[PDB]
Amino acid sequence: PLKTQQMQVGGMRCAACASSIERALERLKGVAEASVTVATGRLTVTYDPKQVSEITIQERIAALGYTLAEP
């Protein structure tokens, strides 16, 4: 099984910087779909909640210079 999830992200907005997050998508294990919004600065991702977790989007935001919020 695999399901959608969406999050706020500190500092991805207003620039092409979202491409440093979304280019890596197609290299990850445990995903199938995702979509940035630069206008507002948010993200949606589809992943397998048993092969992976929010950890398949957390490190890819935290090491890229930003912070994840999934409340």
Question: In this structure, what token pair is assigned to residue 55?
Answer: 């950890």
Measured CA to CA, the distance from residue 40 to residue 5 in angstroms comes to 17
**How is residue 27 annotated by DSSP?**
G
Q: Are 34 and 22 within 8 A, CB to CB?
A: yes
**Domains of the chain with bracketed CATH:** 1-71 (3.30.70.100)
Could you tell me which residues are beta bridge partners of residue 63? none
* Residue type at 44 in one-letter notation: T
Method: NMR
Q: Are 12 and 36 within 8 A, CB to CB?
A: yes
Measured CA to CA, the distance from residue 23 to residue 39 in angstroms comes to 18
